[PDB]
Amino acid sequence: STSNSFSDDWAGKMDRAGLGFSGCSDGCGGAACGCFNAAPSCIFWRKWVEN
Amino acid sequence: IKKDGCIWNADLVGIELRVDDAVCYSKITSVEAVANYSAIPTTIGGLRFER
Numbered sequence: 001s002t003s004n005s006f007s008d009d010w011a012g013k014m015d016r017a018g019l020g021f022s023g024c025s026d027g028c029g030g031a032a033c034g035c036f037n038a039a040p041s042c043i044f045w046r047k048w049v050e051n
Numbered sequence: 052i053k054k055d056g057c058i059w060n061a062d063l064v065g066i067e068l069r070v071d072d073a074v075c076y077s078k079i080t081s082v083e084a085v086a087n088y089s090a091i092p093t094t095i096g097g098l099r100f101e102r
């Protein structure tokens with residue numbers, strides 16, 4: 001049930017961010033995918049709105 | 052074709068054996084096997100699909 005998709009690196013802790021949804025997706029493995037071991041990579045994504 | 056990234060559902064390779072043989076037959080279809088297989092020059096309908 002972990003919905004806190006914030007690995008102490010996202011910029012969601014701001015006053016100008018607004019409303020959003022902490023989501024996540026899957027990635028690929030390999031040298032071109034960013035790792036050196038065949039395994040599904042945890043890739044987090046965050047979207048919001050601005051004015 | 053290693054795991055951890057490759058995806059297959061089921062029933063893509065068959066097994067056959069009579070007496071300690073365990074022979075495997077091929078069932079995967081190539082690209083030039085399905086119907087409606089066109090080429091680089093295509094004139095289906097009014098559109099002329101070029102490259």
Ligand SMILES: *[C@@H]1O[C@H](CO)[C@@H](O)[C@H](O)[C@H]1NC(C)=O
Nearest residue numbers: 084085086087088089095096
């Ligand atoms: C090939 O195209 C025809 C005409 O559009 C269609 O009737 C037929 O179902 C198609 N074949 C396949 C395998 O989709």
